[PDB]
RNA sequence: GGCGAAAGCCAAGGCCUGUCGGGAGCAACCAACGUUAGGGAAUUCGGCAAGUUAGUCCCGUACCUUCGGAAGAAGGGAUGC
RNA sequence: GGGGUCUUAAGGUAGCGUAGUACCUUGCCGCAUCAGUAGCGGCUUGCAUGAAUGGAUUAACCAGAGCUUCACUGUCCCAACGUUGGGCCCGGUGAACUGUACAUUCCAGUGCGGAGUCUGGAGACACCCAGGGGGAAGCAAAGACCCUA
RNA sequence: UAUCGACCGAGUGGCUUGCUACCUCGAUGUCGGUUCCCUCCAUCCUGCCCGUGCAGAAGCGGGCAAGGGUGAGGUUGUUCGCCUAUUAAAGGAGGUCGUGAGCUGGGUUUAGACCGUCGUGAGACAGGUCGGCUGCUAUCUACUGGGUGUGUAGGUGUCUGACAAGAACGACCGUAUAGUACGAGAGGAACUACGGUUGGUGGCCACUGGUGUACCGGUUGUUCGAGAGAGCACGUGCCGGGUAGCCACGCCACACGGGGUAAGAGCUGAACGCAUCUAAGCUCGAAACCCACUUGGAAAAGAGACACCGCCGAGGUCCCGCGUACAAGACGCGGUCGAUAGACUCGGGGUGUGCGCGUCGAGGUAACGAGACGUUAAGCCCACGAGCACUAACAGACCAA
């Protein structure tokens, strides 16, 4: 994937619970896998800001509730390094679900975003109310 | 830059950005502003903070 | 069916014992190319410190951007070039044939070696020009020492002696580089042979650490669950199977970690000046002011402050040098906090 | 002190005899502990081990039931000087 | 069991049922999970349920067996630092286990087919400290399994 | 004969199962897992190739090849296997079905108990079920690290390199190439140059993070009459902050290219006038082999080389102050021709505003009064640096060609 611009410790886990950051009707989601990612024996597979991972809806709408689906973090608690020194994290880990196109599937997306996942999925960064 | 908290000078290639959840944007100098942060404590009441100075 | 998983550490890098030479002696040097030089310097570490820089990486989104570095400081006074060493080739590989000195020596030099009272310079030139003809000349070295008593956060005055080949154009001009170098009095600084923003191949003896088990040392896991409490925490598994009937020397063992020699490829020298510029508030911790020649290593350097480092142009370097780069910023900041 | 023959602390009284000591910031390793970012049972046969909760007052309390119970259900609030 | 009685007197009623009883078996459908040889509900032809050899069912009780959820956490990802007592060095005190002999081994082979000691090579200067225990088919108890008397 | 492939026939392995009863009954602990190390190739991925029912993309099949990799999870004790999402791929096997003087103890397989079936009964079951123990101070050998001696045969310093170890590097994604070659279209590459991620490896501590029973502060109970200041509440009563140091969750570094080959593509070329990649010869060509790179390495018995100092004195030991070192030993530095350690003072840091006094303070006749402000960027403290010979590195003993 093209350099994200920003050194990452990821703050999550297969089996980690996530805020669901849009409007598709999945309040909160579960980690189940990343997108490219080949770990180490013993070790839970790790994801953090900017992976795409692939998910199963925990609580939401009936409809959207057990479904399986692509989405991309866009905010963590731990922290990230930025090209400047300077440390970043936010008040909590959140996701928006996206299709195979990798375009946000919600019309809108909660809460801030890191301006490192707008250099992967544009379209989403582009659906974001504030890029942080 | 100015830290958000005690209002010291953040020496560069230092410190940490944290993002509230409405989008707000705090930078803390150090691990301390941010802990007193936490306690609920308010820079204003601290002595040793540059802003209660 | 047992999940597959690489060795614990590396097999590269013993036997994991105590450095025989606190003074790290390299094993390879920089192929003949440019003019006649000296291929290696030396110093004394002191810390740490960033800088912001203005990224040079063409081919870099952030090209032209500020760049916060982490640095090394190290002090870098002159050293002096005291003998012109000369190998010879040999069925047996290369051998010493003889040495060429000079007269002006370091007045503390009689700490570490028998400073010579009565030598002949020519009578050895001449051994070696006769060798040179007879097409039996293996490379040429300079024996090089540091002068410690430059640096008052070093407590020793005792100089640390090492050998630096001497790589350059044709073996005649190459030779005649190196008697100069040496006549003079030796002296010469890390200007001389680096510039900033090359790479340089650091060695240094890491800093010790006395016994260590396997889980610090090898990089083993610690029991886990039930297992952490029955009685064995950090010991591994088994010495091996049944048979072969023997503990090999490759499974992960407790002893000597640390204080082993270890050259660092490929480090980005960031810049090169004198003065007391990167100090540090309150000083450096467990070591003094620097304030004096000194040279800033990007990243890391093996050992613990104080320790001689050695700087040798990288050998295999990654990356074409992109040189001066712009320090915007560097930090004084105290270290202590 | 507190509900208390509870804890903890302290008198009267007893003792330094749950009787080998001296050294090394005192390494590995072990016993018994303290603290650990983010994640939060992914560990394991099994949450084993540890932890969570906690005293008291007010509000409030489901299924089921032998009408006794369930019940301190759960849940919420208060607490010093 | 056979057929639309036969044995041996009767021929399994009410219940319950893949059971702590169901071999086949992870039975089939459903719930729950990303995924459930588990658990629960239903079906149920029950290899081989069933009425004081008690059946069914059951509030309360339980250091009894299994399952799920919320909360919490170094159980784990993945380990780190620290505390106390040991460990290590020194004075003093001072055992035991074990011992055919020899013994610095290693890779192969051979041999009663599982060798430090045989064969062929390889390696090997001696002694000492600390360590975790690969081997001595380690030490411990004339194997309690099995057969024989 | 791209691919699939019956019958029948010939084999190799020693992974399954069976047979045998050679070894062991004065004991070789069982399944599964776990941890840790080596290996095999009948290769799952990665590299290089051949064929195709090969346009491309992608498959399918085959060849060389064991450098590296082959992971996380749900039921089950499971091995096995079924299932889920990731993946380049999530290959199989040997090591006493490696690994209990390493762990676990869920299954098996004592003594308790229930069920079904069988038995007149005691009781049984190659059925199910609940419960049910894991000893030992290492003598030798083996290896990981550390020492003392002897040999080579006065000392200091620098080297050499026989050999030895390495995976020190493996893999993926993305961008440009390019919506290009190819193709009606749909779809859709590559060489090469770049950016990054992952697994592995070595190191480091400016940054972020953890610790930090140094330290500073808050505060509960109780004892010292109160205040001040303290003890105890387990090796901090509890709580908050946290320097150094140590750390990872942090940060730095880990090629390019040569050489020789395999499969394979070829050249020249005969036997055989032609043909023929092969027989002699040659050009190429794999993540594999060798080198390059890193680490060890004068005990390499051919026991090494160089330079200087010294043989009445070079150098070393003891001693003393110490740590860049450390379990003993070892290693390194300084020793007045001195900043080696401590005191002191600055600096740089940690806490967070001291004791006392003054004013204010709901009230209360008053006494009394939780607490607020000021004095006070205060007080207390520092495993760091600098200055500084004040104190202590003194005095001095010895070996030595
Ligand atoms: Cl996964
Ligand atoms: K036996
Ligand atoms: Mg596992
Ligand atoms: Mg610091
Ligand atoms: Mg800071
Ligand atoms: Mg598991
Ligand atoms: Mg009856
Ligand atoms: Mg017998
Ligand atoms: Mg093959
Ligand atoms: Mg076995
Ligand atoms: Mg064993
Ligand atoms: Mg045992
Ligand atoms: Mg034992
Ligand atoms: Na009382
Ligand atoms: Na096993
Ligand atoms: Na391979
Ligand atoms: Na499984
Ligand atoms: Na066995
Ligand atoms: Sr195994
Ligand atoms: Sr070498
Ligand atoms: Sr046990
Ligand atoms: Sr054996
Ligand atoms: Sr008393
Ligand atoms: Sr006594
Ligand atoms: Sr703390
Ligand atoms: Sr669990
Ligand atoms: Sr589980
Ligand atoms: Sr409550
Ligand atoms: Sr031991
Ligand atoms: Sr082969
Ligand atoms: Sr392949
Ligand atoms: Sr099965
Ligand atoms: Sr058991
Ligand atoms: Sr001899
Ligand atoms: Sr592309
Ligand atoms: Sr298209
Ligand atoms: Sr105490
Ligand atoms: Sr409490
Ligand atoms: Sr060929
Ligand atoms: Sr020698």
Known sequence: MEALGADVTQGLEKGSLITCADNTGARELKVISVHGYSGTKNRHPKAGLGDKITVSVTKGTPEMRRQVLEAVVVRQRKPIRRPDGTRVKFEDNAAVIVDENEDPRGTELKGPIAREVAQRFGSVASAATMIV | ?53 | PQPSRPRKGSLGFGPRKRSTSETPRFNSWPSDDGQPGVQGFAGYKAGMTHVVLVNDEPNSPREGMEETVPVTVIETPPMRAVALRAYEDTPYGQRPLTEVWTDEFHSELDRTLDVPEDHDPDAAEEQIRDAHEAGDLGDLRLITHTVPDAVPSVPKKKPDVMETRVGGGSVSDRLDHALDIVEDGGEHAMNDIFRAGEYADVAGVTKGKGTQGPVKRWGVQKRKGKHARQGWRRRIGNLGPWNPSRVRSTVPQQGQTGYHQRTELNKRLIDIGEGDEPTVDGGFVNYGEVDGPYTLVKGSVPGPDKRLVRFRPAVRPNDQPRLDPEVRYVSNESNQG
């Open chain 2, 1 to 53: 830059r100015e830290c958000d908290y005690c209002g010291t000078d953040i020496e560069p290639g230092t410190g940490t950005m944290f993002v509230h959840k409405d989008g707000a944007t705090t930078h803390f100098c150090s691990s301390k502003c941010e802990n007193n942060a936490d306690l609920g404590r308010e820079a204003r009441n601290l002595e040793w903070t540059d802003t209660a100075r």
